[PDB]
Amino acid sequence: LSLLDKIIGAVDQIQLTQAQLEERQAEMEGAVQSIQGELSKL
Amino acid sequence: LSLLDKIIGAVDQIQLTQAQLEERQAEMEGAVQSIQGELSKL
């Protein structure tokens, strides 16, 4: 197991995690926008 | 200071930052859930 194999697997872990963190952010942005609409409606 | 030392230190910075961004997300998810409960309670 080379340094390059370790670097590659770290990069892969990071990219997978970034996609999951973005999806979580989008879910929460929808929830917050729904709350803002509830508190802002006439 | 090699290219590999730079790559390693960048990867390390990124992984530390990802753990901190996740912790911030969890704190905010708790705060948003508390707001949702306040606005949803009977």
Epitope: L1, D5, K6, I7, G9, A10, D12, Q13, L16, T17, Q20 | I8, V11, D12, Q15, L16, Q18, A19, E22
Partner: nanobody, 115 residues
Framework: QVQLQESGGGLVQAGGSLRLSCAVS????????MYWYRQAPGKQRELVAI???????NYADSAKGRFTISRDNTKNTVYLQMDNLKPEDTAVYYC?????????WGQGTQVTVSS
Amino acid sequence: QVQLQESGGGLVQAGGSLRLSCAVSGIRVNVNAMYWYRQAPGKQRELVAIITTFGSTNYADSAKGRFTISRDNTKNTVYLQMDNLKPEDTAVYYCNAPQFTDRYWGQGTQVTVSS
């Protein structure tokens, strides 16, 4: 699949020490950053400690210098040494890799600290 087998929890007195272990299969701990989490009853999962691929560490503020994360590459095992334990550390402790926290959690290991 990835297998996560946590052990080393139990019942400990305040001021005591534990060393948790997570035996990992399906990914290499010397390739992947690895995290320890804890979850107290009815509370949100809290990140406790992280070790990066190249061995840098970070801790939650609740650890405040008491916890040390480490690994054994040959045993493909991640460890969390916990010193000067407090009742507030009572929780189930879990090890994971960040890319799988949306996917699978092991059974965890129960840590109970009593005064």
